[PDB]
């Protein structure tokens, strides 16, 4: 009776020490602890039971040598829903980490949602998120960035292209949208004084501030044009300007400086003028001399092949030369230019021979008729219509 029996159930009240292998073929059921100085193994399932305190696995750090960690680590499954206090939303938490702080944890809250928190930098190879993305800090991309949706910036300086010494960028300052440039070597900085293009956010009016060059034509459909402070409409100078029929490309307003002898010999020149004086009145008048070829400005007006005309103004290249203007008109139905005619002005007056008038002095004519009187020197000759009589008076 004070020995243990091998055939029936017994209760051992002494402390046993087993020096040989122990073999079990039925459940081991303990109400206390289990320390093993060697490794341990179980089949299929290991369960950590909970009787009021959260369950955990602890990985000891061991001695500070070899491949051992600096701190012990643990896996703990816990919560605060039943904790009674400010926060009770962390329903189920699977937490990993060490003596200092957690490394990471996954959790399901009361609302049923799952979060996987990392207390540092996550370092994946690839990322593939099926839902949203939020990043509070600066983002950097090593290659292209493609979106099926819209790119949106809430920064004034919104979109920037950097290359070489210069940064170009789009800036919305709520009043206007600017296309701006940086100083050389300040690619990430602010804008310089240049204002290449801007758009008024309210009116849509565009302003270009550093000059504009256009190729292949400009058309203003409405509102007209205002220019400060000059317009150079420079026509196409060809050798055949005198006889060149207009085309749809050459109609319109323009000017050409014809300064080459080969061409302006074909155009009208100016006239040498001689100043003469009336012996009687002392009033001067100009008399036309020889035609002299001269360079000049050819100017065209009119917008269609029906409506087109030209002015030819000569300019002096010699100290004694004078300026004379000429005009012509395009004749579509005749398919030719009208002949140049001289413009009459104070420097190129019409001549008595040009209009069919009698010269003021030294004149010769076929016949003349006088009604009231004819004075010769001091002798007046007066007809008397009532009778058939003439009177010779003198003073």
């Amino acid at each position: 009776s004070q020995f243990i029996r091998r055939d029936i159930a017994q209760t051992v009240n002494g402390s046993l020490t087993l020096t040989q292998q122990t073999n079990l073929s039925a459940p081991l059921v303990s109400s206390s602890t289990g320390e093993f100085g060697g490794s341990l193994a179980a089949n299929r399932t290991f369960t950590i039971r909970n009787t009021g305190a959260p369950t955990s696995i602890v990985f000891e750090k061991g001695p500070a040598s070899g491949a051992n960690p600096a701190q012990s680590m643990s896996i703990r499954v816990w919560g605060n829903q039943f904790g009674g206090g400010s926060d009770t939303t962390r329903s189920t938490v699977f937490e990993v980490g060490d003596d200092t702080s957690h490394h990471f944890y996954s959790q399901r809250n009361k609302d049923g949602n799952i979060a996987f928190n990392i207390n540092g930098t996550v370092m994946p190879i690839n990322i593939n998120a099926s839902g949203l993305m939020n990043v509070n800090g600066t983002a950097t991309f090593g290659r292209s960035v493609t979106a099926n949706g819209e790119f949106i910036s809430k920064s004034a300086n919104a979109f920037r292209a950097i290359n070489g010494d210069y940064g170009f960028f789009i800036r919305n300052d709520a009043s206007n949208t600017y296309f701006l440039l940086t100083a050389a070597g300040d690619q990430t900085g602010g804008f310089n004084g240049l204002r290449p293009l801007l758009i008024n956010n309210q009116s849509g009016q565009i302003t270009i501030g550093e000059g504009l060059i256009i190729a292949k034509g400009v058309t203003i459909n409405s509102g007209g044009l205002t220019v400060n402070s000059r317009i150079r409409s420079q026509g196409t100078k060809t050798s055949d300007l005198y006889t060149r029929a207009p085309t749809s490309d050459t109609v319109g307003f323009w000017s050409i400086d014809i300064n080459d002898s080969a061409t302006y010999n074909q155009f009208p020149g100016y006239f040498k003028m001689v100043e003469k004086t009336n012996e009687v009145t002392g009033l001067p008048y100009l008399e036309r001399g020889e035609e002299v070829k001269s360079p000049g400005t050819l100017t065209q007006f009119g917008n269609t092949l029906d409506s087109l005309y030209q002015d030819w103004i000569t300019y002096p290249t010699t100290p004694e030369a004078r300026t004379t203007r000429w005009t012509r008109t395009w004749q579509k139905t005749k398919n030719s230019w009208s002949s140049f005619v001289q413009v009459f002005d104070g420097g190129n007056p019409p001549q008595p021979s040009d209009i069919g008038a009698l010269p003021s002095d030294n004149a010769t004519m076929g016949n003349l008729t006088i009604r009231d009187f004819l004075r010769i020197g001091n002798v007046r000759i007066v007809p008397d219509p009532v009778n058939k009589t003439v009177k010779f008076e003198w003073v």
Copy 2:
């Protein structure tokens, strides 16, 4: 109690057929090997390694939730290592899966699929501090960045509305609708919305032709290299009005076409005025003619034409500012070689005709002249005077 084989022997191997209950500390110094289970009501510890063996069913660790109190979880959790490559069915790509989670659904899992690649799936929101990915990135949902976004490569949008800058009440954005690329604006307070009626700038995607639809202002000059210009429906080329316009030599900046309204006496007193006309009538023919009076100073338009310092001329047109005033035109030409403007000359027209003294013609009436020669006949009243060239005689007829 009788045979000595009904007690356990202490020196040799024994087989116990009774259930032992050990109430004191038990000490082992050799392997414990069971073919059955192990329940401990207290904690457990082992050295170096814990192994969960597999004999046909996947292995797991279970963390029980316990009573709903203190720091306990609402649900039990488990770590399970499993797969489906040998499962026999639709999917056999999940070779090795390390899964953590609870009664409801998994929290996360890492897996190596059959092609050998590793994936780490999170059934919710991953919440790191920093992110550093050595490879690709894909996001199916909306993305938001709290500060700048910098790329060594190209930003590419496949949206019609592709790039938007929002500030204050306005959103500006670039829109490619496949036919044209637009720079557009939103209504005030609709920064993320669609475009209004405004069309600031657009580009034809096929021709590259640009259309500006809300007006254009330019500074520091414009040049059209080709194609010319067409304007609807007027052009105001506004010249620089200075005090010395009368004697001002042209410069490379002032050559070209323009007009100036010279409306200040201080300046137009220097310019030609208009002439007063008096309408007189020939007693004989009854036909009227205009005779020039006094010159009267007047404001006017000065217009320049010509594009170079060689080729340049001006017209001066006066306009009336008094009820009886008249309009007269004048012309001049730039003389480079002489370095001066030619003097203004009067333009002759129906309202400002040339005078007989201007052209050297005899007045139609009350005229006085040096000498005259008549060839055929001279009539005075009713008396004709006719030369006979063959003889030396004149005859007097009635």
Copy 3:
């Protein structure tokens, strides 16, 4: 002797085999291993002890059947800070994975910082990062991308909008910023030959290379305008052009082709000219005939309602027709156009009656005075004013 006692401490030197349930109610303390062929369970805590070598848990793969994994997996807690060698920065590492490679690990380095490394693709639903973002490879977004800060590209081709057959993009090639277009069907490719708009990064000067259209008006504040090689300023043609007072919208330079009888019958026409000949000199002169209505160009100059004038030029639509120019001036204070006056030119010379001069032949006048001599045929008549005499001479 040599049976086990059940009331006092005993040492068992034989290998016991327990075929029935074993019940413990006090600590089990082993210096060796523990294999269980069934499941295992403990309360509250399981601890893996470390005596010089890193601790781990192993999940066996089992037979290749059912839901078993292809490879065994393990959790290992280790480090290299005390390893003595090239790298000692991995202080505490919690690593999970298999024989081929690690699946993932979290680590605290010697600097105290935490990293969570994933040896593959991380696949979350949502992402919410409180700090920075870096991606070395290509990135793709399925919807919109919004930044509170600036978007910056360091690529030449910086920003691209793709739709339909065409890709539009902004390109900074360090010298100039271009707005470029792709060939049809090459949306991700390079630019074609088109050059819609460019901006010089140094000067800000804009160049448009494929033509320009403007609506609602253009204003050049400075620098003027230069055009190659013509300007068509097309005025607004209305039915009341003859009497139409200018408005602020119609002042300025333009031309109109008035080709409809309903309108040009109101304007001056041209004059038929007849060629006459001086009986004495044989020199021809032109005499004015009938006025014939004709289409023409109406051209306006001047920029204000004070400063404004027009020229009216007629063009021939019939073989015998001639061209005549006319002029008028806007009289603001009188609120009317001055009446059209004829321009005198070689083709439309003034008539003797227009200027008050005596015709060169067959003339009639009121009175005449001669000072020097009067010749009639062969008879000279010479006054001698001093002594009061007349002389009758012959040639």
